């Protein structure tokens, strides 16, 4: 209701979405986002699970990038979803372990500064160091922006931050589905697609296993 | 006034003319009282639109098989189809009960409460259906040329043939019903013999109507 | 005034105001304000879609006589496979007629160029787009408008004419054409059926049921061919 | 007001103010079973209590039989996962039974004591100093203290709309079940089992199909 981009110019979109929020289109057939504390919990939900989904299409994408060329490394032809059953230096329980207990804490203190900001901006053990003041949820800074790139035009940058992840996760969804129904790594699918446009579609791969 | 369906009978004074196809028949005074009328004459609304879809599928069918294009009778449509299309009976017959039973569930409730279908409660959808009448549910769902929403007297017109073609609809499918347990053929097959001779076959010669012939 | 019958009263919904009106609406399908904007739309793309099949169906027989229309989607073989046409196809014939429909329920709402925001379409009729979809408009444009309602209306009944004679006879339209001034006193519909009460005899459908194309057999069925006098 | 029949007529005890302010509100009520406020307030607690069950339970059933369908676990099924557990037990199921019952028993009766009494369970020198954390919130069946260590029930804004997540999802749980057990007497195999044989071929696997739940065709 306002002059800002939409996903439908002409179309009613919902009165509660201001443009206050990052990559605001009125996109929300469902309104799923009436409520104003769900609305406040997605945003952060959103950009969590666009920054995993960023770090994982990237980590899906290099590794494959780097394997067909002449760069070589111990892990390069095995698959992303065949990573699991790898020799490691040790076993995936007890980096799990690890793992669990590291996010355990960080996301404790992720909550603790979500449910109010600014309580969580202190270094526990060294007592000098600590964040700005100005903080909000999901945006930590500080020692988070070391090179200080915030400084600038952050609504361009929270945008483009929130587009990349929109289509990260669209990406990862992607792997997914390639990765069931081709049951081929995504970078084959996309020079086999690459090759000859016409015959390679979704279409076509789904109607010869028919 | 009005015709009525007995010349020289006074007409009820249940049946004023108001509704249409209103013809002054009703000599078991079945709908007397006003909520009884208005459950009959939605009743024979629906009545009428089935009959109607049945005679025109029957009849298009028949057609179909008269000439060589293979289509099965309507007394042998439904094994037909089963028997050629891996179809399981009950399964489709329960399927067609969900479906009529949501349909003809939300019409007996408007009926009971006239514009509570209307709420939004069933996907937001209001004016969808609100319904104009009783056995009249304007909308852009039921009706979306809009033909009952203008030219009030092109609609009454409209309404008139709607009943009277319902009417001729259930009585033709009454005769399918009668031709089919009397003759044993379709009702095209039993027009062509009747065209072919007219005056040795028809009812009074079959040997079932009439048993004293 | 123009009119479909002359010495006729046209109906009330109809009051000359719309391009073609001539006062032609038996059943009036066009008595409601709503209904009548919405076909308004739908009679326009059905005029240009019609004007441009006959248009296309007149130029393929004339410069290709040995390919029928009727089987120009069957034998026509292109380095682009058929799925991968029909998802292009899909695709920008979905944004077309998505950025269309918008317009019509919310006029002036997608008349801006959304890769470039110095393009803009000006402010026009519904239906009627303009601008950049009109380059060149030689004559008065009431005028032209009637003359293109026109002959969308004559081109819609020579598509259908055309789909009717293709699967009656199985020839072109300049292939039934020319047979038809052949013989004129045998070749026309009358002379080929005849319905009376003892008999009921239709021509034989020319287009085969199935066409194997690729394996596949897509039924190709005359349409309504039982109740074909 | 939503309702669980458009156009229906509501119960005039369900359109009270109290009855309203239960999760779930839809005035489904054919048979007046909550004409009576002490009996509408009694079956909220049931209604609570089978909620509760019956998510656990078919929690319990589902997720260790979407497991055992891959290779995450090899738990039986459930109508035979109590022969096998009381197999290689430490005890046979009369006394398991006899210590359920015991136990159940106490803290069942500490409930019935609350529900006939609120707060009634904090009296003084009863708990070892415990009965003080007895005591639960203004509405029945939603207690604090041991219960909810995490303290989702603070906000006001939520708890409206947390209580409906617990009761719809346990009458869909308390249905789930109930399929559980007909399906069991009508295929021979297990939930999951028949979801799949289900999804195999849905238009002839059904239940219009195994010529049990439709005698006459
Ligand atoms: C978002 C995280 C994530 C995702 C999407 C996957 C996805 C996958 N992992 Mg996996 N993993 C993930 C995290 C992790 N894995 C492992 C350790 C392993 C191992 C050891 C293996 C996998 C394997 C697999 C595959 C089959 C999963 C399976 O056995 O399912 C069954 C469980 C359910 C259906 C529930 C694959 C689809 C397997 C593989 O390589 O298959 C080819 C395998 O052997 N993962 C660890 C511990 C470090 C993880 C996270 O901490
Ligand atoms: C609505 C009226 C209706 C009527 C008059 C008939 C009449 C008939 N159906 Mg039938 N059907 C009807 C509805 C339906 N049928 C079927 C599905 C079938 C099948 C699959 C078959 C028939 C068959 C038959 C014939 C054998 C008798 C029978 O089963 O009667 C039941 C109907 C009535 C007793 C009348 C009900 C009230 C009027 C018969 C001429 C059989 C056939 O054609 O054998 C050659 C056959 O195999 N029907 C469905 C879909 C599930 C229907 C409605 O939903
Ligand atoms: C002398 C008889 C006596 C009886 C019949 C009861 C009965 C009861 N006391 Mg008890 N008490 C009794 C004396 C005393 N109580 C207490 C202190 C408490 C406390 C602190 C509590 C009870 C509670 C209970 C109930 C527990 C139900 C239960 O566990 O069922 C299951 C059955 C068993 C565990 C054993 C059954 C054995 C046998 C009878 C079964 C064969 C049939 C129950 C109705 C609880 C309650 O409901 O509070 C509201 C509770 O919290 N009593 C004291 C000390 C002050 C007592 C002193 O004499
Ligand atoms: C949150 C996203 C994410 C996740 C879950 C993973 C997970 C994993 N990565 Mg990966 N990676 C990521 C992002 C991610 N990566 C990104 C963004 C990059 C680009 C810099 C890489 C580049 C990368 C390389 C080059 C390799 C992995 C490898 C691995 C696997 C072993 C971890 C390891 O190398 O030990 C920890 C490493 C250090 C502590 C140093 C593991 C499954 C290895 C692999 O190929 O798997 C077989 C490996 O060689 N990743
Ligand atoms: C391209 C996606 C993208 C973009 C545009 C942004 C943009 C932004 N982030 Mg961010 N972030 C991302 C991904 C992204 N992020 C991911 C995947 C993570 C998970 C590790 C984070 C986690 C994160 C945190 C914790 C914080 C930010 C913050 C910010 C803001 C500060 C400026 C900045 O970070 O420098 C600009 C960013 C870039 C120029 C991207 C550089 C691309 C690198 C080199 C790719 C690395 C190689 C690749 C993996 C292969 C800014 C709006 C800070 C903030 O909100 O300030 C208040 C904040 O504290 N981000
Ligand atoms: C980042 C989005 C993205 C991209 C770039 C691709 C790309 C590709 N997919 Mg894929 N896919 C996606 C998302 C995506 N997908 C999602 C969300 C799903 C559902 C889980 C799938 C499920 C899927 C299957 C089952 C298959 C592919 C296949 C393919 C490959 C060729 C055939 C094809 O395009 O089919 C059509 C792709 C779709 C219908 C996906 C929907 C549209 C997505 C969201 C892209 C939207 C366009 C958007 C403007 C971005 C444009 C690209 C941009 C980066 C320039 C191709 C390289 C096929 C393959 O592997 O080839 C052998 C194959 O069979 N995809
Ligand atoms: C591929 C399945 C199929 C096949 C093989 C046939 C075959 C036949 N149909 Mg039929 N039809 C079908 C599907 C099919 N139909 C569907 C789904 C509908 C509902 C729209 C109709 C509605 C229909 C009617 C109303 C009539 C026929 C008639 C006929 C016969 C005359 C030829 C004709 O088709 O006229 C063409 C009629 C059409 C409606 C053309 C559309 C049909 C094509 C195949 C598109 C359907 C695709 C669908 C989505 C799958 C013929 C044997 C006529 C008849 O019975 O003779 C007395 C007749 O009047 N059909
Ligand atoms: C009130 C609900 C309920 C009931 C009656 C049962 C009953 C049963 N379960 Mg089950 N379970 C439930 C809920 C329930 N479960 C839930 C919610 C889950 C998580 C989805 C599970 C997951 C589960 C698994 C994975 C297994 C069972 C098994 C069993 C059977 C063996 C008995 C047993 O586990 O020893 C008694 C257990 C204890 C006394 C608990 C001891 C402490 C445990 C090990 C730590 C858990 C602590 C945590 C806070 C709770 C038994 C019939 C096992 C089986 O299939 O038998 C062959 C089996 O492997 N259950
Ligand atoms: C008015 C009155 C009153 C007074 O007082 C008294 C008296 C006199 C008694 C009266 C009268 C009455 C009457 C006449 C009644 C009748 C009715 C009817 C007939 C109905 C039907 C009705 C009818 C109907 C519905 C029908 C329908 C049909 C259908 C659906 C069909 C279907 C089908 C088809 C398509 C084909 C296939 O293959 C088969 C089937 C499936 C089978
Ligand atoms: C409302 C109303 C009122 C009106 O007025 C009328 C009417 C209509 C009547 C109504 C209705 C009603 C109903 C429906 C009811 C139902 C209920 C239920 C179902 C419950 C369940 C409920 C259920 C439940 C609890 C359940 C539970 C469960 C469980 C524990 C389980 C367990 C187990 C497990 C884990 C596993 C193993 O291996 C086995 C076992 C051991 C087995
Ligand atoms: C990918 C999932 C897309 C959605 C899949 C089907 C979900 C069906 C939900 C349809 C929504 C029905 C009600 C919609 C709008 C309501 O009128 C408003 N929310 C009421 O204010």
Same mark, same amino acid.
């Given at each position: 209701?306002?002059?800002?981009?939409?996903?439908? $110019?002409?179309?009613?979109?919902?009165?509660?979405?201001?443009?206050?929020?990052?990559?605001?289109?009125?996109?929300?057939?469902?309104?799923?986002?009436?409520? $104003?504390?769900?609305?406040?919990?997605?945003?952060?939900?959103?950009?969590?699970?666009?920054?995993?989904?960023?770090?994982?299409?990237?980590?899906?994408?290099?590794?494959?990038?780097?394997?067909?060329?002449?760069?070589?490394? $111990?892990?390069?032809?095995?698959?992303?979803?065949?990573?699991?059953?790898?020799?490691?230096?040790?076993?995936?329980?007890?980096?799990?372990?690890?793992?669990?207990?590291?996010?355990?804490?960080?996301?404790?203190?992720?909550?603790?500064?979500?449910?109010?900001?600014?309580?969580?901006?202190?270094?526990?053990?060294?007592?000098?160091?600590?964040?700005?003041?100005?903080?909000?949820?999901?945006?930590?800074?500080?020692?988070?922006? $070391?090179?200080?790139?915030?400084?600038?035009?952050?609504?361009?940058?929270?945008?483009?931050?929130?587009?990349?992840?929109?289509?990260?996760?669209?990406?990862?969804?992607?792997?997914?589905?390639?990765?069931?129904?081709?049951?081929?790594?995504?970078?084959?699918?996309?020079?086999?697609?690459?090759?000859?446009?016409?015959?390679?579609?979704?279409?076509?791969?789904?109607?010869?296993?028919? | 006034?009005?015709?009525?369906?007995?010349?020289?009978?006074?007409?009820? *004074?249940?049946?004023?003319?108001?509704?249409?196809?209103?013809?002054?028949?009703?000599?078991?005074?079945?709908?007397?009282?006003?909520?009884?009328?208005?459950?009959?004459?939605?009743?024979?609304?629906?009545?009428?639109?089935?009959? /109607?879809?049945? *005679?025109?599928?029957?009849?298009?069918?028949?057609?179909?098989?008269?000439?060589?294009?293979?289509?099965?009778?309507?007394?042998?449509?439904?094994?037909?189809?089963?028997?050629?299309?891996?179809?399981?009976?009950?399964?489709? /017959?329960?399927?067609?009960?969900?479906? /009529?039973?949501?349909?003809?569930?939300?019409?007996?409730?408007?009926?009971?409460?006239?514009?509570?279908?209307?709420?939004?409660?069933?996907?937001?959808?209001?004016?969808?259906?609100?319904?104009?009448?009783?056995?009249?549910?304007?909308?852009?769902?039921?009706?979306? /040329?809009?033909?009952?929403?203008?030219?009030?007297?092109?609609?009454?017109?409209?309404?008139?043939?709607?009943?009277?073609?319902?009417?001729?609809?259930?009585? *033709?499918?009454?005769?399918?019903?009668?031709?089919?347990?009397?003759?044993?053929?379709?009702?095209?097959?039993?027009?062509?013999?009747?065209?072919?001779?007219?005056?040795?076959?028809?009812? *009074?010669?079959?040997?079932?109507?009439?048993?004293?012939? | 005034?123009?009119?479909?019958?002359?010495?006729?009263?046209?109906?009330?919904?109809?009051?000359?105001?719309?391009?073609?009106?001539?006062?032609?609406?038996?059943?009036?399908?066009?008595?409601?304000?709503?209904?009548?904007?919405?076909?308004?739309?739908?009679?326009?793309?059905?005029?240009?879609?019609?004007?441009?099949?006959?248009?296309?169906?007149?130029?393929?027989?004339?410069?290709?006589?040995?390919?029928?229309?009727?089987?120009?989607?069957?034998?026509?073989?292109?380095?682009?496979?058929?799925?991968?046409?029909?998802?292009?196809?899909?695709?920008?014939?979905?944004?077309?007629?998505?950025?269309?429909?918008?317009?019509?329920?919310?006029?002036?709402?997608?008349?801006?160029?959304?890769?470039?925001?110095?393009?803009?379409?000006?402010?026009?009729? #519904?239906?009627?787009?303009?601008?950049?979809?009109?380059?060149?408009?030689?004559?008065?444009?009431?005028?032209?408008?009637?003359?293109?309602?026109?002959?969308?209306?004559?081109?819609?009944?020579?598509?259908?004419?055309?789909?009717?004679?293709?699967? #009656?006879?199985?020839?072109?339209?300049?292939?039934?054409?020319?047979?038809?001034?052949?013989?004129?006193?045998?070749?026309?519909?009358?002379?080929?059926?005849? #319905? #009376?009460?003892?008999?009921?005899?239709?021509?034989?459908?020319?287009?085969?049921?199935?066409?194997?194309?690729?394996?596949?057999?897509?039924?190709?069925?005359?349409?309504?061919?039982?109740?074909?006098? | 007001?939503?309702?669980?029949?458009?156009?229906?007529?509501?119960?005039?005890?369900?359109?009270?103010?109290?009855? @309203?302010?239960?999760?779930?509100?839809?005035?489904?009520?054919?048979?007046?079973?909550?004409?009576?406020?002490?009996?509408?307030?009694?079956?909220?607690?049931?209604?609570?209590?089978?909620?509760?069950?019956?998510?656990?339970?078919?929690?319990?059933?589902?997720?260790?039989?979407?497991?055992?369908?891959?290779?995450?676990?090899?738990?039986?099924?459930?109508?035979?996962?109590?022969?096998?557990?009381?197999?290689?037990?430490?005890?046979?199921?009369?006394?398991?039974?006899?210590?359920?019952?015991?136990?159940?028993?106490?803290?069942?009766?500490?409930?019935? @004591?609350?529900?006939?009494?609120?707060? =009634?369970?904090?009296?003084?020198?009863?708990?070892?100093?415990?009965?003080? =954390?007895?005591?639960?919130?203004?509405?029945?069946?939603?207690?604090?203290?041991?219960?909810?260590?995490?303290?989702?029930?603070?906000?006001?804004?939520?708890?409206?709309?947390?209580?409906?997540?617990?009761?719809?999802?346990?009458?869909?749980?308390?249905?789930?079940?109930?399929?559980?057990?007909?399906?069991?007497?009508?295929?021979?195999?297990?939930?999951?089992?028949?979801?799949?044989?289900?999804?195999?071929?849905?238009?002839?696997?059904?239940?219009?199909?195994?010529?049990?739940?439709?005698?006459?065709?």
């Amino acid at each position: 209701d306002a002059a800002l981009p939409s996903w439908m $110019p002409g179309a009613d979109l919902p009165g509660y979405l201001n443009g206050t929020l990052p990559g605001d289109f009125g996109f929300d057939p469902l309104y799923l986002g009436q409520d $104003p504390v769900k609305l406040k919990w997605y945003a952060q939900a959103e950009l969590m699970n666009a920054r995993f989904a960023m770090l994982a299409v990237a980590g899906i994408l290099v590794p494959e990038l780097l394997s067909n060329i002449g760069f070589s490394w $111990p892990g390069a032809g095995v698959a992303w979803y065949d990573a699991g059953k790898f020799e490691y230096f040790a076993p995936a329980s007890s980096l799990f372990g690890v793992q669990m207990l590291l996010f355990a804490w960080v996301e404790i203190r992720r909550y603790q500064d979500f449910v109010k900001p600014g309580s969580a901006n202190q270094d526990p053990i060294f007592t000098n160091n600590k964040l700005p003041d100005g903080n909000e949820p999901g945006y930590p800074g500080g020692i988070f922006d $070391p090179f200080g790139w915030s400084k600038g035009d952050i609504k361009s940058l929270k945008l483009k931050e929130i587009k990349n992840g929109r289509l990260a996760m669209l990406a990862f969804a992607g792997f997914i589905g390639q990765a069931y129904t081709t049951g081929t790594t995504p970078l084959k699918n996309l020079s086999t697609h690459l090759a000859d446009p016409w015959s390679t579609t979704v279409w076509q791969n789904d109607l010869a296993r028919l | 006034v009005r015709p009525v369906w007995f010349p020289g009978n006074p007409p009820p *004074a249940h049946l004023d003319g108001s509704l249409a196809g209103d013809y002054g028949f009703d000599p078991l005074f079945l709908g007397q009282e006003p909520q009884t009328l208005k459950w009959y004459v939605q009743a024979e609304l629906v009545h009428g639109r089935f009959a /109607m879809l049945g *005679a025109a599928g029957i009849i298009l069918t028949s057609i179909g098989a008269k000439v060589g294009l293979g289509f099965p009778e309507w007394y042998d449509a439904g094994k037909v189809v089963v028997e050629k299309n891996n179809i399981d009976f009950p399964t489709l /017959m329960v399927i067609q009960f969900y479906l /009529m039973g949501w349909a003809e569930t939300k019409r007996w409730y408007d009926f009971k409460n006239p514009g509570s279908q209307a709420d939004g409660s069933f996907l937001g959808f209001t004016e969808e259906f609100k319904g104009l009448e009783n056995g009249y549910p304007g909308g852009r769902f039921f009706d979306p /040329m809009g033909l009952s929403r203008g030219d009030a007297a092109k609609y009454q017109e409209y309404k008139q043939k709607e009943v009277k073609n319902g009417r001729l609809a259930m009585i *033709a499918c009454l005769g399918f019903a009668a031709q089919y347990a009397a003759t044993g053929k379709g009702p095209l097959d039993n027009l062509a013999d009747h065209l072919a001779d007219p005056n040795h076959v028809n009812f *009074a010669t079959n040997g079932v109507s009439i048993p004293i012939a | 005034r123009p009119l479909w019958l002359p010495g006729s009263t046209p109906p009330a919904h109809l009051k000359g105001d719309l391009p073609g009106d001539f006062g032609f609406d038996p059943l009036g399908l066009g008595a409601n304000a709503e209904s009548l904007k919405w076909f308004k739309e739908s009679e326009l793309v059905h005029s240009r879609w019609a004007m441009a099949a006959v248009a296309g169906i007149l130029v393929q027989e004339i410069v290709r006589p040995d390919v029928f229309w009727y089987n120009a989607g069957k034998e026509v073989e292109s380095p682009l496979g058929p799925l991968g046409l029909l998802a292009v196809e899909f695709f920008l014939m979905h944004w077309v007629e998505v950025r269309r429909w918008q317009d019509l329920r919310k006029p002036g709402s997608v008349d801006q160029d959304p890769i470039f925001s110095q393009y803009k379409l000006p402010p026009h009729e #519904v239906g009627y787009p303009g601008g950049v979809f009109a380059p060149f408009i030689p004559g008065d444009l009431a005028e032209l408008k009637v003359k293109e309602i026109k002959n969308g209306r004559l081109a819609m009944l020579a598509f259908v004419g055309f789909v009717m004679a293709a699967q #009656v006879t199985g020839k072109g339209p300049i292939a039934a054409l020319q047979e038809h001034l052949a013989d004129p006193w045998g070749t026309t519909i009358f002379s080929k059926a005849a #319905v #009376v009460p003892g008999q009921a005899v239709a021509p034989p459908c020319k287009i085969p049921a199935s066409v194997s194309y690729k394996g596949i057999e897509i039924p190709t069925p005359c349409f309504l061919q039982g109740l074909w006098p | 007001r939503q309702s669980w029949l458009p156009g229906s007529q509501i119960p005039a005890h369900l359109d009270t103010p109290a009855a @309203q302010a239960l999760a779930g509100n839809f005035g489904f009520d054919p048979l007046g079973l909550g004409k009576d406020p002490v009996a509408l307030r009694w079956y909220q607690q049931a209604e609570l209590i089978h909620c509760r069950t019956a998510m656990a339970g078919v929690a319990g059933i589902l997720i260790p039989g979407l497991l055992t369908k891959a290779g995450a676990l090899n738990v039986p099924e459930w109508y035979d996962a109590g022969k096998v557990a009381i197999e290689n037990s430490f005890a046979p199921w009369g006394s398991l039974l006899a210590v359920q019952l015991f136990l159940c028993g106490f803290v069942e009766a500490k409930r019935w @004591q609350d529900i006939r009494k609120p707060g =009634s369970q904090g009296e003084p020198g009863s708990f070892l100093g415990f009965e003080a =954390s007895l005591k639960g919130t203004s509405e029945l069946g939603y207690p604090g203290g041991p219960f909810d260590p995490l303290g989702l029930s603070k906000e006001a804004d939520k708890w409206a709309d947390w209580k409906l997540k617990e009761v719809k999802n346990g009458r869909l749980a308390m249905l789930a079940f109930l399929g559980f057990v007909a399906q069991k007497y009508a295929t021979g195999a297990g939930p999951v089992d028949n979801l799949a044989a289900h999804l195999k071929d849905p238009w002839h696997v059904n239940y219009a199909t195994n010529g049990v739940s439709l005698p006459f065709l």
